[PDB]
Tab-separated table of C-alpha atoms in Angstrom:
chain	number	residue	atom	x	y	z
A	4	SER	CA	27.221	55.730	59.741
A	5	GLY	CA	24.340	53.101	60.570
A	6	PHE	CA	26.347	51.607	63.328
A	7	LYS	CA	25.820	53.072	66.896
A	8	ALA	CA	27.778	50.935	69.661
A	9	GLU	CA	25.164	52.086	72.492
A	10	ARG	CA	22.042	50.852	70.222
A	11	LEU	CA	23.973	47.366	70.311
A	12	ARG	CA	24.909	47.387	74.007
A	13	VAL	CA	21.592	48.444	74.918
A	14	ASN	CA	19.612	46.032	72.804
A	15	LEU	CA	21.948	43.064	73.665
A	16	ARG	CA	21.246	43.662	77.266
A	17	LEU	CA	17.325	43.696	76.449
A	18	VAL	CA	17.682	40.528	74.304
A	19	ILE	CA	19.276	38.740	77.353
A	20	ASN	CA	16.252	40.184	79.790
A	21	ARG	CA	13.433	39.017	77.157
A	22	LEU	CA	15.136	35.551	76.812
A	23	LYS	CA	15.431	34.735	80.191
A	24	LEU	CA	11.899	35.423	80.769
A	25	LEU	CA	10.636	33.369	77.981
A	26	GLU	CA	12.722	30.478	78.859
A	27	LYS	CA	11.076	30.393	82.304
A	28	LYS	CA	7.670	31.118	80.906
A	29	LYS	CA	7.877	28.268	78.171
A	30	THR	CA	9.411	25.766	80.881
A	31	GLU	CA	6.191	26.403	82.773
A	32	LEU	CA	3.916	26.072	80.007
A	33	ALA	CA	5.546	22.647	79.011
A	34	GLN	CA	4.544	21.256	82.651
A	35	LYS	CA	1.059	22.139	81.684
A	36	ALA	CA	1.477	20.674	78.500
A	37	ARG	CA	2.674	17.254	79.669
A	38	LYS	CA	-0.260	16.812	82.005
A	39	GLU	CA	-2.531	17.192	79.095
A	40	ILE	CA	-0.682	14.509	77.005
A	41	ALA	CA	-1.220	12.235	80.094
A	42	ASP	CA	-5.103	13.040	79.871
A	43	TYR	CA	-5.162	12.087	76.249
A	44	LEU	CA	-3.264	8.826	76.975
A	45	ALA	CA	-5.800	8.074	79.843
A	46	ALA	CA	-8.536	8.588	77.497
A	47	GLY	CA	-6.995	6.129	75.069
A	48	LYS	CA	-6.507	8.876	72.195
A	49	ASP	CA	-2.939	7.766	71.667
A	50	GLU	CA	-2.846	8.933	68.177
A	51	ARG	CA	-3.497	12.486	69.118
A	52	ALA	CA	-1.183	12.394	71.882
A	53	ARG	CA	1.676	11.635	69.386
A	54	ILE	CA	0.864	14.823	67.456
A	55	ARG	CA	0.558	17.118	70.646
A	56	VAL	CA	4.019	15.975	71.795
A	57	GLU	CA	5.625	17.249	68.550
A	58	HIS	CA	4.465	20.813	70.105
A	59	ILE	CA	6.100	19.851	73.268
A	60	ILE	CA	9.432	18.728	71.578
A	61	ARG	CA	9.591	21.821	69.509
A	62	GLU	CA	8.990	24.247	72.470
A	63	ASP	CA	11.656	22.338	74.480
A	64	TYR	CA	14.167	22.573	71.446
A	65	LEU	CA	13.337	26.317	71.289
A	66	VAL	CA	14.002	26.668	75.106
A	67	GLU	CA	17.441	25.156	74.644
A	68	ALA	CA	18.143	27.369	71.624
A	69	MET	CA	17.315	30.584	73.560
A	70	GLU	CA	19.585	29.390	76.118
A	71	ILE	CA	22.234	29.379	73.537
A	72	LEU	CA	21.489	32.762	71.975
A	73	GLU	CA	21.528	33.864	75.584
A	74	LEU	CA	25.103	32.940	75.966
A	75	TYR	CA	26.210	34.560	72.884
A	76	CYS	CA	24.700	37.818	73.669
A	77	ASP	CA	26.513	37.724	77.148
A	78	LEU	CA	29.595	37.002	75.201
A	79	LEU	CA	29.484	39.941	73.109
A	80	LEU	CA	28.699	42.023	75.994
A	81	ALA	CA	31.956	40.595	77.664
A	82	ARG	CA	33.989	41.253	74.865
A	83	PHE	CA	32.229	44.381	73.604
A	84	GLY	CA	35.758	46.305	74.083
A	85	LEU	CA	37.076	44.328	70.943
A	86	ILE	CA	33.790	45.050	69.027
A	87	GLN	CA	34.200	48.612	69.622
A	88	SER	CA	38.023	48.718	69.011
A	89	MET	CA	38.719	46.758	65.921
A	90	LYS	CA	37.089	47.101	62.360
A	91	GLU	CA	37.760	43.595	61.539
A	92	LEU	CA	35.880	40.615	62.952
A	93	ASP	CA	37.664	38.368	65.458
A	94	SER	CA	37.801	34.733	65.506
A	95	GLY	CA	36.615	34.634	69.041
A	96	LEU	CA	33.341	36.342	68.240
A	97	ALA	CA	32.739	34.994	64.925
A	98	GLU	CA	30.565	32.151	66.049
A	99	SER	CA	28.576	34.394	68.146
A	100	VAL	CA	28.029	37.069	65.523
A	101	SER	CA	27.141	35.061	62.652
A	102	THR	CA	24.761	32.934	64.767
A	103	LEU	CA	22.965	35.832	66.082
A	104	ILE	CA	22.699	37.312	62.340
A	105	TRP	CA	21.542	33.896	61.299
A	106	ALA	CA	18.800	33.370	64.250
A	107	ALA	CA	17.314	36.947	64.130
A	108	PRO	CA	14.661	36.191	61.236
A	109	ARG	CA	13.668	32.882	62.947
A	110	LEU	CA	13.214	34.359	66.488
A	111	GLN	CA	12.323	37.874	65.849
A	112	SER	CA	8.475	37.165	66.187
A	113	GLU	CA	9.023	36.518	69.555
A	114	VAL	CA	12.307	38.515	70.652
A	115	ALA	CA	11.965	41.772	68.840
A	116	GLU	CA	15.083	43.386	69.953
A	117	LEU	CA	16.905	40.677	68.329
A	118	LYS	CA	16.234	42.215	65.027
A	119	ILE	CA	18.008	45.534	65.987
A	120	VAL	CA	21.101	43.382	67.334
A	121	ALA	CA	21.347	41.720	64.058
A	122	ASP	CA	20.829	45.125	62.005
A	123	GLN	CA	23.796	46.689	64.130
A	124	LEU	CA	26.239	43.609	63.704
A	125	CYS	CA	25.390	43.905	60.036
A	126	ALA	CA	25.771	47.679	59.979
A	127	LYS	CA	29.407	46.988	61.819
A	128	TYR	CA	30.812	44.061	59.601
A	129	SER	CA	28.782	45.086	56.316
A	130	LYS	CA	25.770	43.898	54.603
A	131	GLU	CA	27.646	41.265	52.654
A	132	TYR	CA	28.873	39.311	55.721
A	133	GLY	CA	25.312	39.595	56.925
A	134	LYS	CA	24.140	37.885	54.013
A	135	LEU	CA	26.688	35.297	54.077
A	136	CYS	CA	25.454	34.597	57.670
A	137	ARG	CA	21.763	34.259	57.140
A	138	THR	CA	22.308	31.234	54.620
A	139	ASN	CA	25.538	29.969	56.593
A	140	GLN	CA	27.791	30.503	53.439
A	141	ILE	CA	30.117	31.703	56.175
A	142	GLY	CA	30.062	28.296	57.636
A	143	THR	CA	30.451	29.614	60.984
A	144	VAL	CA	26.756	29.315	62.589
A	145	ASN	CA	26.651	26.899	65.400
A	146	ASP	CA	25.326	23.577	64.302
A	147	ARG	CA	23.438	22.598	67.402
A	148	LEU	CA	21.316	25.912	67.535
A	149	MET	CA	20.653	25.525	63.732
A	150	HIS	CA	19.294	21.953	64.419
A	151	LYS	CA	17.063	23.082	67.294
A	152	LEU	CA	15.519	25.761	65.257
A	153	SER	CA	14.908	23.345	62.224
A	154	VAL	CA	11.400	22.967	60.755
A	155	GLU	CA	11.640	19.360	60.275
A	156	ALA	CA	9.225	16.887	62.217
A	157	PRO	CA	10.767	15.179	65.284
A	158	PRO	CA	12.037	11.561	64.659
A	159	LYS	CA	9.165	9.031	65.315
A	160	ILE	CA	11.140	7.295	67.819
A	161	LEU	CA	11.718	10.634	69.658
A	162	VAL	CA	7.850	11.052	69.966
A	163	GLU	CA	7.347	7.428	71.186
A	164	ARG	CA	10.118	7.939	73.870
A	165	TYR	CA	8.577	11.110	75.035
A	166	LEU	CA	5.187	9.315	75.323
A	167	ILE	CA	6.853	6.518	77.263
A	168	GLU	CA	8.477	8.551	79.738
A	169	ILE	CA	5.211	10.922	80.212
A	170	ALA	CA	2.920	7.858	80.555
A	171	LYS	CA	5.476	6.390	83.321
A	172	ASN	CA	5.574	9.439	85.090
A	173	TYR	CA	1.676	10.134	85.356
A	174	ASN	CA	1.289	6.135	85.997
A	175	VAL	CA	-0.744	5.977	82.722
A	176	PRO	CA	-0.930	2.687	80.744
A	177	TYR	CA	1.025	3.297	77.479
A	178	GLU	CA	1.799	0.686	74.607
A	179	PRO	CA	4.449	2.114	71.973
A	180	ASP	CA	4.266	1.803	68.285
A	181	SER	CA	5.898	-1.491	67.770
A	182	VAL	CA	7.039	-0.666	64.030
A	183	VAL	CA	8.735	2.557	65.318
A	184	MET	CA	10.523	0.597	68.318
A	185	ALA	CA	11.542	-1.946	65.890
A	186	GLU	CA	12.795	0.824	63.124
A	187	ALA	CA	15.088	2.371	66.071
B	101	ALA	CA	-23.670	43.105	65.365
B	102	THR	CA	-20.955	42.721	68.073
B	103	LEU	CA	-19.695	39.168	66.623
B	104	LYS	CA	-19.257	41.113	63.408
B	105	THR	CA	-17.297	44.330	64.890
B	106	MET	CA	-15.134	41.821	66.952
B	107	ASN	CA	-15.188	38.496	65.554
B	108	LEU	CA	-12.901	35.548	66.574
B	109	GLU	CA	-10.008	36.643	64.656
B	110	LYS	CA	-9.807	39.784	65.771
B	111	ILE	CA	-10.218	38.522	69.463
B	112	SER	CA	-7.378	36.227	68.798
B	113	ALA	CA	-5.088	39.300	67.524
B	114	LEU	CA	-6.228	41.322	70.569
B	115	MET	CA	-5.590	38.528	72.863
B	116	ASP	CA	-1.968	37.647	71.511
B	117	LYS	CA	-1.217	41.412	71.607
B	118	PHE	CA	-2.239	41.678	75.248
B	119	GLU	CA	-0.188	38.817	76.206
B	120	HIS	CA	2.781	39.902	74.369
B	121	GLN	CA	2.677	43.611	75.712
B	122	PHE	CA	2.681	42.136	79.309
B	123	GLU	CA	5.890	40.211	78.560
B	124	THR	CA	7.424	43.627	77.775
B	125	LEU	CA	6.164	45.159	81.054
B	126	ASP	CA	7.947	42.117	82.695
B	127	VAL	CA	11.140	42.925	81.000
B	128	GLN	CA	10.591	46.766	82.010
B	129	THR	CA	9.926	45.776	85.738
B	130	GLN	CA	12.974	43.609	85.902
B	131	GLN	CA	15.469	46.312	84.748
B	132	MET	CA	13.946	48.967	86.998
B	133	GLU	CA	14.552	46.673	89.871
B	134	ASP	CA	17.971	45.857	88.692
B	135	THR	CA	18.694	49.383	88.572
B	136	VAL	CA	17.492	50.158	92.041
B	137	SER	CA	19.334	47.282	93.323
B	138	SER	CA	22.523	48.360	91.799
B	139	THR	CA	21.583	51.678	92.918
B	140	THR	CA	21.497	50.969	96.643
B	141	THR	CA	24.138	48.299	96.636
B	142	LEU	CA	25.982	49.805	99.573
B	143	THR	CA	22.909	49.882	101.717
B	144	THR	CA	22.298	46.195	101.327
B	145	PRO	CA	25.587	44.207	101.416
B	146	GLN	CA	25.189	40.558	100.598
B	147	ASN	CA	27.200	39.003	103.775
B	148	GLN	CA	25.121	41.136	106.049
B	149	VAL	CA	21.775	39.720	104.541
B	150	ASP	CA	23.064	36.170	104.635
B	151	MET	CA	24.124	36.413	108.289
B	152	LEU	CA	20.742	37.854	109.311
B	153	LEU	CA	19.167	34.752	107.490
B	154	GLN	CA	21.606	32.389	109.087
B	155	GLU	CA	20.831	34.156	112.571
B	156	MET	CA	17.052	33.895	111.813
B	157	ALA	CA	17.148	30.175	110.833
B	158	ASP	CA	19.236	29.326	113.920
B	159	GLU	CA	16.627	30.926	116.169
B	160	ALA	CA	13.771	29.022	114.252
B	161	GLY	CA	15.747	25.654	114.410
B	162	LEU	CA	15.777	25.410	110.715
B	163	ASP	CA	18.823	23.539	109.391
B	164	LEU	CA	19.233	25.003	105.810
B	165	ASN	CA	22.507	26.963	105.376
B	166	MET	CA	21.556	30.318	104.157
B	167	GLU	CA	25.132	31.459	102.661
B	168	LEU	CA	24.965	28.798	100.059
B	169	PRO	CA	23.419	28.658	96.700
B	170	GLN	CA	20.136	26.723	97.827
B	186	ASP	CA	11.763	17.490	88.130
B	187	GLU	CA	13.044	14.366	87.138
B	188	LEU	CA	10.984	13.870	84.266
B	189	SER	CA	12.293	17.129	82.666
B	190	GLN	CA	15.682	15.619	83.218
B	191	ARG	CA	14.852	12.306	81.679
B	192	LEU	CA	13.099	14.048	78.536
B	193	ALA	CA	16.371	16.274	78.224
B	194	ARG	CA	18.398	13.030	78.167
B	195	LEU	CA	16.128	11.792	75.400
B	196	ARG	CA	16.825	14.889	73.285
B	197	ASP	CA	20.661	14.252	73.711
B	198	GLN	CA	20.405	10.658	72.900
B	199	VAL	CA	18.785	11.098	69.356
C	1	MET	CA	13.012	87.433	111.184
C	2	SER	CA	16.442	88.166	109.777
C	3	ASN	CA	17.553	86.534	106.421
C	4	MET	CA	20.282	84.306	108.733
C	5	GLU	CA	17.718	83.554	111.325
C	6	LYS	CA	15.362	82.028	108.308
C	7	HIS	CA	18.552	79.960	107.101
C	8	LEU	CA	19.251	79.000	110.906
C	9	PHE	CA	15.488	77.822	111.208
C	10	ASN	CA	15.818	75.801	108.168
C	11	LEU	CA	19.056	74.142	109.203
C	12	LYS	CA	17.455	73.188	112.663
C	13	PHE	CA	14.450	71.777	111.062
C	14	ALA	CA	16.713	69.617	108.323
C	15	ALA	CA	18.589	68.320	111.304
C	16	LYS	CA	15.495	67.172	112.974
C	17	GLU	CA	13.933	65.809	110.058
C	18	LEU	CA	17.009	63.638	109.227
C	19	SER	CA	17.046	62.734	112.869
C	20	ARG	CA	13.296	61.422	112.552
C	21	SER	CA	14.117	59.516	109.386
C	22	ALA	CA	16.789	57.545	111.315
C	23	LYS	CA	14.285	56.654	114.217
C	24	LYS	CA	11.813	55.550	111.408
C	25	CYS	CA	14.405	53.348	110.050
C	26	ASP	CA	15.234	51.769	113.202
C	27	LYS	CA	11.814	51.047	114.156
C	28	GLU	CA	11.321	49.384	110.663
C	29	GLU	CA	14.511	47.389	110.964
C	30	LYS	CA	12.635	45.756	114.388
C	31	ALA	CA	9.316	45.423	112.168
C	32	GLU	CA	11.058	43.593	109.316
C	33	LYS	CA	12.963	41.523	111.654
C	34	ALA	CA	9.706	40.229	113.159
C	35	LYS	CA	8.613	39.463	109.557
C	36	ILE	CA	11.627	37.325	108.736
C	37	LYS	CA	10.860	34.980	111.748
C	38	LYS	CA	7.246	34.465	110.886
C	39	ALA	CA	8.330	33.691	107.185
C	40	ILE	CA	10.939	31.251	108.495
C	41	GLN	CA	8.458	29.443	110.516
C	42	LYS	CA	6.131	28.983	107.412
C	43	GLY	CA	8.620	27.886	105.099
C	44	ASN	CA	8.360	30.880	102.655
C	45	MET	CA	12.235	31.444	102.193
C	46	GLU	CA	11.869	33.685	99.120
C	47	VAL	CA	9.512	36.072	101.345
C	48	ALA	CA	12.003	35.571	104.273
C	49	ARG	CA	14.802	36.939	102.141
C	50	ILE	CA	12.756	39.813	101.037
D	4	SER	CA	45.787	81.012	78.605
D	5	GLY	CA	43.605	77.907	78.814
D	6	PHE	CA	45.415	76.639	82.045
D	7	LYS	CA	43.613	77.424	85.347
D	8	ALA	CA	45.450	75.862	88.353
D	9	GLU	CA	42.089	75.998	90.343
D	10	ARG	CA	40.224	74.201	87.801
D	11	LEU	CA	42.823	71.552	88.068
D	12	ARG	CA	43.082	71.437	91.959
D	13	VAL	CA	39.354	71.420	92.434
D	14	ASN	CA	38.811	68.619	89.785
D	15	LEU	CA	41.906	66.564	90.877
D	16	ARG	CA	40.016	66.346	94.530
D	17	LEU	CA	36.708	65.628	92.742
D	18	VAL	CA	38.185	62.783	90.950
D	19	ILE	CA	39.474	61.351	94.006
D	20	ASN	CA	36.130	61.474	95.611
D	21	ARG	CA	34.472	59.767	92.814
D	22	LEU	CA	37.110	57.029	92.135
D	23	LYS	CA	36.881	56.333	95.993
D	24	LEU	CA	33.114	55.773	95.869
D	25	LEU	CA	33.326	53.803	92.589
D	26	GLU	CA	35.547	51.394	93.929
D	27	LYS	CA	33.519	50.594	97.140
D	28	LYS	CA	30.410	50.020	94.988
D	29	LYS	CA	32.281	48.022	92.471
D	30	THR	CA	33.537	46.064	95.101
D	31	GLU	CA	30.049	45.056	96.629
D	32	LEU	CA	28.635	44.465	93.078
D	33	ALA	CA	31.400	41.807	92.567
D	34	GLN	CA	30.198	39.767	95.857
D	35	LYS	CA	26.725	39.785	94.360
D	36	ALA	CA	27.999	38.906	90.979
D	37	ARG	CA	30.301	35.774	92.675
D	38	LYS	CA	27.081	34.633	94.067
D	39	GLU	CA	25.292	34.405	90.670
D	40	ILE	CA	28.414	32.069	89.373
D	41	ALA	CA	27.795	29.800	92.003
D	42	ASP	CA	24.028	29.601	91.159
D	43	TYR	CA	25.194	28.891	87.470
D	44	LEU	CA	27.473	26.292	88.517
D	45	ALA	CA	25.046	24.717	90.927
D	46	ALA	CA	22.705	24.283	87.950
D	47	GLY	CA	25.547	22.745	85.897
D	48	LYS	CA	25.716	25.581	83.293
D	49	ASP	CA	29.213	25.693	83.593
D	50	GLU	CA	29.755	26.969	80.021
D	51	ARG	CA	27.772	30.207	80.616
D	52	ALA	CA	29.518	30.550	84.018
D	53	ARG	CA	32.883	31.071	81.977
D	54	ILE	CA	31.355	33.927	80.169
D	55	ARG	CA	29.963	35.764	83.228
D	56	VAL	CA	33.234	35.303	84.936
D	57	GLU	CA	34.865	37.639	82.347
D	58	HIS	CA	32.919	40.245	83.457
D	59	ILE	CA	33.929	39.853	87.153
D	60	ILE	CA	37.603	39.794	86.230
D	61	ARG	CA	37.165	43.011	84.047
D	62	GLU	CA	35.448	44.706	87.058
D	63	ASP	CA	37.970	43.319	89.441
D	64	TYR	CA	40.794	44.906	87.143
D	65	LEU	CA	38.976	48.066	86.546
D	66	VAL	CA	38.845	48.552	90.652
D	67	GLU	CA	42.439	47.984	90.593
D	68	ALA	CA	43.107	50.526	87.923
D	69	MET	CA	40.861	53.144	89.808
D	70	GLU	CA	43.348	52.582	92.830
D	71	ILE	CA	46.274	53.540	90.797
D	72	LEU	CA	44.737	56.694	89.105
D	73	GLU	CA	43.471	57.671	92.756
D	74	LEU	CA	47.241	57.371	94.121
D	75	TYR	CA	48.392	59.728	90.822
D	76	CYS	CA	45.731	62.409	91.496
D	77	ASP	CA	46.653	62.385	95.003
D	78	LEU	CA	50.376	62.753	93.974
D	79	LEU	CA	49.791	65.610	91.889
D	80	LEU	CA	47.869	67.421	94.832
D	81	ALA	CA	50.819	66.603	97.123
D	82	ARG	CA	53.204	68.302	94.650
D	83	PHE	CA	51.098	70.983	93.443
D	84	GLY	CA	53.476	73.618	94.400
D	85	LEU	CA	55.549	72.191	91.514
D	86	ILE	CA	53.087	71.918	88.988
D	87	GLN	CA	52.190	75.686	89.469
D	88	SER	CA	55.768	76.824	89.978
D	89	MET	CA	57.703	75.298	87.090
D	90	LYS	CA	56.742	75.459	83.325
D	91	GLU	CA	58.611	72.256	82.503
D	92	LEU	CA	57.461	68.992	83.672
D	93	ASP	CA	59.357	67.260	86.348
D	94	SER	CA	60.651	63.880	86.308
D	95	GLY	CA	58.786	62.724	89.474
D	96	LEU	CA	55.414	63.902	88.060
D	97	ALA	CA	56.025	62.378	84.367
D	98	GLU	CA	54.522	59.018	85.177
D	99	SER	CA	51.311	60.640	86.784
D	100	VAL	CA	50.673	63.184	84.211
D	101	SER	CA	51.242	61.258	81.278
D	102	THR	CA	49.150	58.219	82.715
D	103	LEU	CA	46.221	60.603	83.783
D	104	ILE	CA	45.976	61.868	80.106
D	105	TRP	CA	46.182	58.598	78.710
D	106	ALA	CA	43.528	57.058	81.206
D	107	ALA	CA	40.875	59.831	80.549
D	108	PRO	CA	39.595	58.912	77.333
D	109	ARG	CA	39.233	55.352	78.475
D	110	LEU	CA	37.473	56.128	81.862
D	111	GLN	CA	35.713	59.454	81.148
D	112	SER	CA	32.335	57.393	80.635
D	113	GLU	CA	32.550	56.761	84.432
D	114	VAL	CA	34.624	59.696	85.909
D	115	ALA	CA	33.437	62.781	84.228
D	116	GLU	CA	35.720	65.104	85.844
D	117	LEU	CA	38.802	62.999	84.805
D	118	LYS	CA	38.214	64.634	81.057
D	119	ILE	CA	38.505	68.047	82.797
D	120	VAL	CA	42.035	66.953	84.737
D	121	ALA	CA	43.475	65.672	81.380
D	122	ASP	CA	42.463	68.861	79.643
D	123	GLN	CA	44.137	71.085	82.180
D	124	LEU	CA	47.233	68.977	82.054
D	125	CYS	CA	47.319	69.378	78.216
D	126	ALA	CA	46.798	73.079	78.444
D	127	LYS	CA	49.744	73.130	80.834
D	128	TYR	CA	52.191	70.937	79.217
D	129	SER	CA	50.966	71.748	75.456
D	130	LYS	CA	48.519	69.830	73.358
D	131	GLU	CA	51.630	67.764	71.748
D	132	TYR	CA	52.649	66.332	74.705
D	133	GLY	CA	49.009	65.556	75.293
D	134	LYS	CA	48.903	63.564	72.158
D	135	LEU	CA	52.263	61.685	72.643
D	136	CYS	CA	50.740	60.736	76.112
D	137	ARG	CA	47.443	59.100	74.517
D	138	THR	CA	49.377	56.746	72.368
D	139	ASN	CA	52.070	56.142	75.156
D	140	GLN	CA	54.678	57.385	72.323
D	141	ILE	CA	56.129	59.333	75.376
D	142	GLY	CA	57.095	55.929	76.822
D	143	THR	CA	56.185	56.966	80.529
D	144	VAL	CA	52.362	55.863	81.199
D	145	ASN	CA	52.305	53.191	83.762
D	146	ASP	CA	52.394	49.679	82.354
D	147	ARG	CA	50.245	47.849	85.000
D	148	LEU	CA	47.336	50.384	84.497
D	149	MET	CA	47.376	49.875	80.765
D	150	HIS	CA	47.293	46.149	81.253
D	151	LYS	CA	44.257	46.386	83.674
D	152	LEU	CA	42.398	48.590	81.214
D	153	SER	CA	43.072	46.494	78.203
D	154	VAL	CA	40.360	45.495	75.924
D	155	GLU	CA	41.742	41.944	75.549
D	156	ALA	CA	39.720	38.871	76.870
D	157	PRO	CA	41.103	37.471	80.015
D	158	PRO	CA	43.503	34.481	79.640
D	159	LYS	CA	41.454	30.976	79.507
D	160	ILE	CA	43.566	29.594	82.598
D	161	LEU	CA	42.442	32.698	84.649
D	162	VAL	CA	38.742	32.080	83.926
D	163	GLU	CA	38.913	28.397	85.150
D	164	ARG	CA	40.961	29.453	88.276
D	165	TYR	CA	38.168	32.037	88.831
D	166	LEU	CA	35.672	29.160	88.703
D	167	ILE	CA	37.688	26.775	90.820
D	168	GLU	CA	37.936	29.371	93.738
D	169	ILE	CA	34.314	30.527	93.527
D	170	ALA	CA	33.200	26.863	93.480
D	171	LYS	CA	35.201	25.960	96.241
D	172	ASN	CA	34.103	28.911	98.427
D	173	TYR	CA	30.227	28.221	97.720
D	174	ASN	CA	30.865	24.398	98.137
D	175	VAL	CA	29.577	23.768	94.565
D	176	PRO	CA	31.059	20.634	92.728
D	177	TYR	CA	33.052	22.008	89.527
D	178	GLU	CA	35.280	20.026	87.023
D	179	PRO	CA	37.629	22.574	85.426
D	180	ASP	CA	38.572	22.309	81.395
D	181	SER	CA	41.020	19.534	81.236
D	182	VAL	CA	42.536	21.130	77.981
D	183	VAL	CA	42.979	24.642	79.647
D	184	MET	CA	44.495	23.051	82.740
D	185	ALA	CA	47.048	21.096	80.570
D	186	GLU	CA	47.937	24.043	78.338
D	187	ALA	CA	48.771	26.092	81.563
């Protein structure tokens, strides 16, 4: 009881559709954002440009994270026979199932169906496994994805390198923070 | 009166909801079109479409080969993310 | 009109309706082919493919 | 009682019509899918392309399985005189009858009439024979068909070889997984 295979199958397909669409939209919005950084740098407002590129870095990391989750949903669909057949969790699926349960509370603001995918996977493999996933006590959640959805501020050198590349591309004079470039 | 009944926080909410509900309608159009596409797969074989495009491109003098699966700032900013 | 004459009348009508539908499809293959050429000349490869 | 020869004869013919149609449709959809793999490989998203070809391999195996069942339904129609005449199951038909009963629960999502064919064959040769078929305790179900409808993931070398052939055909540069090509 609780678990319904078709709820999981339908919602996995929906999650892929929604992620596939959000990646495109967010990629386009990053173009518009980078133009705005060049405008701030041209206006000599470098100290603000630094804080505006933190938004760009976070959206870029998020788009990369959405690509990883798209892949794990597509993997659970490809090997959906195993999910439905066994009662134990296979090794091949452990990364995917644990990561999707871990990610859902972070992403479910944007990708509402991802909550239902997580809830069904917890109904299948039990609530206790679901709790061990959400904290990564299960030690199986994908490390790169957890990095990409971290709440920490970007490294100062990443911010500076972003400004250097954007400034170069839009032919705007920029001089990077000497202290940060030295610390690197 | 109207700035009370629809204050900026309420407008902010309404605009967020508006945007998020058109994201959902995009997801729905996509899967209606994917269904119709699979529904009439035998009426449009891929190779026949590819050959008609190549024939029309040959007539137009366009060099682009139509059977094949036919920005650098984005690439460089990606390389930066990998390097850190 | 006999009950069988009614059925014959409807079968003859359905046969013509399908024949008209085939003629309409043929004339629209010609119409869409013309639009591919126009789209290729304007470089609109996405519209050409549609 | 239960068994009606004309229910079986009509539904065997229907099963052939439906399979014959599904094979064509699935073959065409495989063309559209292979083009999509080339697009993923061109975009350098090889790690996803691997998971997308698992779907293609499974549909290709399924089409081959549908061809085997089409043949066994056509065989029971060809030798329908024997079915209707005897009360015992002939040796010549044992493979066909057992395989159709085994396959029905796997396929009856797609081929609804296949359930009725199986139910009639169980009414003819008794429910106990029907149970021995579904588990292949009867040791007569066709091995190639059971392989082709297995829920196991494709071998890694098959996935790599699929990508190599698709990449070659669409003139896309691809470099296969060295570890998998070595393990082979």
